Write a protein that binds this ligand. Sequence first.
Ligand code: QC5
Ligand code: ZN
Length: 195
Amino acid sequence: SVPSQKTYQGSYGFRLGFLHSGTAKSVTCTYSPALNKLFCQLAKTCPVQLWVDSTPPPGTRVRAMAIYKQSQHMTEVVRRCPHHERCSDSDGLAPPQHLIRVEGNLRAEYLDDRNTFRHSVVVPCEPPEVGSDCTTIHYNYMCYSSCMGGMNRRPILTIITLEDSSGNLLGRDSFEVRVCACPGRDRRTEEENLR
Ligand SMILES: CN(C)CCn1cc(-c2ccc(F)cc2)c(-n2cccc2)n1
Ligand SMILES: [Zn+2]
């Protein structure tokens, strides 16, 4: 009833990477290594790098899923709030209920799990562009952490899994996410609080 969040590099040495975007007031997406936490604005591009030591087989896929970080909420499906699920902002592929979208990939598939009811979005693994050392996926988060009747100020984690063609686990990584109006300020504040 709860997806594992255990970091697992697996046989291919799978792990995530994030850009270094800084904490200026104007920043739209920024990652804190000290907090393992991504801060982003609503519906803005979040670049996430996929790193491997060796190339996985054809048919390998990468899935993203959100869960609540606090144990007492972890069995609750993370979904868009009653306002955002009804705002008709679909890209024609993502169901309006899904928090996490993949941007600019027509091969993205959205799953409503028939047993757990959890949402996820999965894309085929593709080779890096010539000249690049990793592949990047662009995610969007479609509700604020503060949305009432949705996340309602509760922190979430995104779990990224590398899967074979049957959906079996090959690798796993994860990060906390806060979707907020001013990611730069919030990252600075939370990093100061930690210190
Ligand atoms: C070590 N270097 C060479 C890795 C380059 N790379 C190939 C794939 C790759 C290429 C084709 C395919 F079918 C599956 C993975 C991939 N990758 C990993 C996650 C998502 C893409 N990275
Ligand atoms: Zn919302």
